Amino acid sequence: ARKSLIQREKKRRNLEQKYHLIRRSSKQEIRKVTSLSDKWEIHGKLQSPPRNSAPARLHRRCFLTGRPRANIRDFGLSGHILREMVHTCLLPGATRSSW
Amino acid sequence: SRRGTVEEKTAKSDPIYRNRLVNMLVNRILKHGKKSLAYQILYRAVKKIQQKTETNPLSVLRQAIRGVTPDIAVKARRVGGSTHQVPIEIGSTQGKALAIRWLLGAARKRPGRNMAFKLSSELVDAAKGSGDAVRKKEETHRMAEANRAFAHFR
Amino acid sequence: MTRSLKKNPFVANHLLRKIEKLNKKAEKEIIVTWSRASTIIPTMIGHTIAIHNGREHLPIYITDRMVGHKLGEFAPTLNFRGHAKNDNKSRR
Amino acid sequence: IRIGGVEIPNHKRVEYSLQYIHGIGRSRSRQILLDLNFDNKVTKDLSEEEVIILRKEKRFNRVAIERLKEIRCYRGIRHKLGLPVRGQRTKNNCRTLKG
Amino acid sequence: TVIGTGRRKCAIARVVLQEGTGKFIINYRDAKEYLQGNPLWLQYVKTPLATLGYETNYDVFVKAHGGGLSGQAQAISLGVARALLKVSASHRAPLKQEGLLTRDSRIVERKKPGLKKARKAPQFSKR
Amino acid sequence: QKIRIKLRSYWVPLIEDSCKQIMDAARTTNAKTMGPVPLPTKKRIFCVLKSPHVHKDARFHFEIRTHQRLIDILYPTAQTIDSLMQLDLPAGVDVEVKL
RNA sequence: CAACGUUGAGUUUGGAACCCUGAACAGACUGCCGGUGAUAAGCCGGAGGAAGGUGAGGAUGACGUCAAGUCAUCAUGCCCCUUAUGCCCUGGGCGACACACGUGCUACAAUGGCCGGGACAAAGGGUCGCGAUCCCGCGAGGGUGAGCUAACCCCAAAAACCCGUCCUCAGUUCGGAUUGCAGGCUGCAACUCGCCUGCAUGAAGCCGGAAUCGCUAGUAAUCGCCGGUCAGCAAUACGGCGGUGAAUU
């Protein structure tokens, strides 16, 4: 929700299109279990570069405020503000439901 | 009573013998919504009783439950401050319903074999005078007629 | 006891490199470590590894009976019943 | 008849009679019916040779309890004390490992 | 040929009556083959034919899809009862007396939020 | 038969009037068209908490009705391509052209 | 997909009748008959009808009560910190314990368990995705890889139920807690902190005091499935779907 916390996660999004764009397929060939008995340790051992880099370290956050919890993949917003948008008229096909 | 009048809630009658009051015995022995296996508890107790008795399975069912059917029971009503144990006379609609509740419990409170023998045993034990089924008819009569003075006659 | 082991046991680069530099002619036992997600490799025999738990570094000995362990299960996370120094009691 | 160890099975069928012995469960009682070649019949109607070839299949009782207490190692913590070893709350529950 | 719909819960079963021997064929299988293992609710399928007397004269073909085994069985009973109205309009009075033309509006619907099993309210701590 | 077009939107009086126009303007060109046949709607139902704190009750309901309908043209003529490509009338509908 | 030609698989031509599907329209309004009732209202029954007496069930919950909750969603007054209660990183912690209380789940069985065969559902999900077929592994799963951007493909082969057989109520061919050993999978990475599989171990517990909770119909009870969150913490949390189906007033 803070401009210091959203920024810390925006720096985790910038290296996703640098390290995980092309050189991720370089380690994805040997981290998995191959059908053959010869599985190399050399690349799984020297796997030191992804310190701050990880695809699982990414949290979606709200696009208006920025809180880590209750994020829906379709909208991208959190349950408090996602509500304020549909209670007005800011999203098409977000009417009242029965069942 | 005046606002909203409902008579009774009834389902489909007895399989092939055709009876609506005997269909309440399959509905009370009903465990968690299995009417398919509840049929195997009543109809197998009809198949195993013909060797123990002589006449039709509908007759021995009615001639035995008359010893389990009560005439008067106690209800808790308060008036003035003290809780009175006033006995109200039970009719034929609630009396036939109270008879199959104590025959249900007496069958389950006898861990012998299967429910096909447990219900068949408490069916003939009501005619001679044995089991926990016939004992509850004489036990409710100990609570009643002893507190006869709390209720006036009709 | 069986954890998350496939083929790669995962031992940190700052763990083995500092031990292979000490396995030249065998010298020095005391070594400081922060990573508790690392696995014990058979060349850690005789070397006293001081592992972090949040509070301080606890000097633990490594033998031949401890191969498939993580060094983190050796260092106590919190204070329960085990081996610890008797603290000076103040006012009740 | 003594099949092995101290525990002697009686009057029941061969699919459960072996479950009294340590090391054999519900799966390993069916596995010794392929190499031992017999059905799931009662133990009273067998043969003198059918007990000897059944005795050759396993037999490791008493010393099977010794391999469970095994070594001690460095860890094996919360076992020497008598607590759940996992992430359970020993404050209210877990009377299975306690007295 | 005479058509007839007949619904129960979420089970639809189109009944088409024709004159013949008397064999009941449900979804390319017989009446005793589809509803196997002697279900008692198989007798309710043959009830609208029993009160009028048409089982030995009329043959039937029915395609059932949706619902349960007990839900499909009451869908045939209403389907034949609505189909016995088009062959003769005089067979309405002795058939409507039992309540076979009428649809059972009972449905196991939605589970309301805040509650577990629709109506079942969560129990709080006592004093 | 050949060219298949998918019309997806949210409100029903908008698509039914737009798909009816691709029937009246497609029959006067050359070949016959198969009428506007609607396929089943993919209706979603999901809940979210209203109050920003401890009030698990009073949870709402949001509906996103994706009304889909199909219309097929038999033979793709030159005068049918000059009509459908220029008739860009959708205000909130999306047209997907498949072969 | 009825009728008609069938590689039996709607499979093909073909047919739109029916089911389903998606927009519209018709319909219950006590309206009609009778009785009760103050020749009112309304109630109690009946007729006709798929459906009646706000049809079932949602959404929708006024003026206001508790200065009840939230300035950790956001926004804002004031105040305070501002080489700092600001900022970065590594490891740890929040899922620590002698205990207590709340809300749930799995059982004490045999209207049950187990083995084999076997009949039907609704509603939703999915392109740094859903992932069949085949091969391999006891299994989780892995290799190869088609199709579906989707009522054309996949996620599932739904479970009770049912037939036969076995057991046949001994803490048990009930119950699974716990524990050892050996693996799989997601991710830098999972000892503390994971899910799942395989093998073995296999207790507590025989329905439970005072007290106390929900529900009147397709509800209670019970049996499966799906979704959101999400790399991963898949039937035990929440939300959503259907199967079977009462009791009493």
Curated annotation (Swiss-Prot), chain A:
Component of the chloroplast ribosome (chloro-ribosome), a dedicated translation machinery responsible for the synthesis of chloroplast genome-encoded proteins, including proteins of the transcription and translation machinery and components of the photosynthetic apparatus. It is found in: Plastid, Chloroplast. Component of the chloroplast small ribosomal subunit (SSU). Mature 70S chloroplast ribosomes of higher plants consist of a small (30S) and a large (50S) subunit. The 30S small subunit contains 1 molecule of ribosomal RNA (16S rRNA) and 24 different proteins. The 50S large subunit contains 3 rRNA molecules (23S, 5S and 4.5S rRNA) and 33 different proteins. It comes from the Eukaryota. Gene3D superfamilies: 1.10.287.1480. GO terms for cellular component: chloroplast; small ribosomal subunit. This is Small ribosomal subunit protein uS14c.
Curated annotation (Swiss-Prot), chain B:
Keywords: Chloroplast, Plastid, Ribonucleoprotein, Ribosomal protein, RNA-binding, rRNA-binding. One of its GO terms (molecular function) is mRNA binding. It is found in: Plastid, Chloroplast. One of its GO terms (cellular component) is chloroplast. Disulfide bonds: none annotated. SUPFAM superfamilies: Ribosomal protein S7. GO terms for biological process: ribosomal small subunit assembly; translation. Component of the chloroplast ribosome (chloro-ribosome), a dedicated translation machinery responsible for the synthesis of chloroplast genome-encoded proteins, including proteins of the transcription and translation machinery and components of the photosynthetic apparatus. Component of the chloroplast small ribosomal subunit (SSU). Mature 70S chloroplast ribosomes of higher plants consist of a small (30S) and a large (50S) subunit. The 30S small subunit contains 1 molecule of ribosomal RNA (16S rRNA) and 24 different proteins. The 50S large subunit contains 3 rRNA molecules (23S, 5S and 4.5S rRNA) and 33 different proteins. Belongs to the universal ribosomal protein uS7 family. This is Small ribosomal subunit protein uS7cz/uS7cy. The lineage of its organism: Eukaryota, Viridiplantae, Streptophyta, Embryophyta, Tracheophyta. The gene is rps7-A.
Curated annotation (Swiss-Prot), chain C:
One of its GO terms (biological process) is translation. InterPro entries: Ribosomal_uS19, Ribosomal_uS19_bac-type, Ribosomal_uS19_CS, Ribosomal_uS19_SF. GO terms for cellular component: chloroplast; mitochondrial small ribosomal subunit. The keyword RNA-binding applies. One of its GO terms (molecular function) is structural constituent of ribosome. Its main location: plastid. Keywords: Chloroplast, Plastid, Ribonucleoprotein, Ribosomal protein, RNA-binding, rRNA-binding. It is found in: Plastid, Chloroplast. It holds the Pfam family Ribosomal_S19. Transmembrane segments: none annotated. Component of the chloroplast small ribosomal subunit (SSU). Mature 70S chloroplast ribosomes of higher plants consist of a small (30S) and a large (50S) subunit. The 30S small subunit contains 1 molecule of ribosomal RNA (16S rRNA) and 24 different proteins. The 50S large subunit contains 3 rRNA molecules (23S, 5S and 4.5S rRNA) and 33 different proteins. uS19c binds directly to 16S ribosomal RNA. Component of the chloroplast ribosome (chloro-ribosome), a dedicated translation machinery responsible for the synthesis of chloroplast genome-encoded proteins, including proteins of the transcription and translation machinery and components of the photosynthetic apparatus. HAMAP family: Ribosomal_uS19. S19 alpha and beta forms differ in pI. S19 beta form is the minor least basic form. Belongs to the universal ribosomal protein uS19 family. This is Small ribosomal subunit protein uS19c. The lineage of its organism: Eukaryota, Viridiplantae, Streptophyta, Embryophyta, Tracheophyta.
From Swiss-Prot, chain E:
GO terms for cellular component: chloroplast; plastid small ribosomal subunit. Its main location: plastid. It comes from the Eukaryota. GO terms for molecular function: RNA binding; rRNA binding; structural constituent of ribosome. Residues 113-127 have a biased composition (Basic residues). One of its GO terms (biological process) is translation. Keywords: Acetylation, Chloroplast, Plastid, Ribonucleoprotein, Ribosomal protein, RNA-binding, rRNA-binding, Transit peptide. It is found in: Plastid, Chloroplast. Residues 104-127 are annotated as: Disordered. Component of the chloroplast ribosome (chloro-ribosome), a dedicated translation machinery responsible for the synthesis of chloroplast genome-encoded proteins, including proteins of the transcription and translation machinery and components of the photosynthetic apparatus. Belongs to the universal ribosomal protein uS9 family. Component of the chloroplast small ribosomal subunit (SSU). Mature 70S chloroplast ribosomes of higher plants consist of a small (30S) and a large (50S) subunit. The 30S small subunit contains 1 molecule of ribosomal RNA (16S rRNA) and 24 different proteins. The 50S large subunit contains 3 rRNA molecules (23S, 5S and 4.5S rRNA) and 33 different proteins. uS9c binds directly to 16S ribosomal RNA. uS9c interacts with translation factor pY (PSRP1). This is Small ribosomal subunit protein uS9c. It comes from Spinacia oleracea (Spinach).
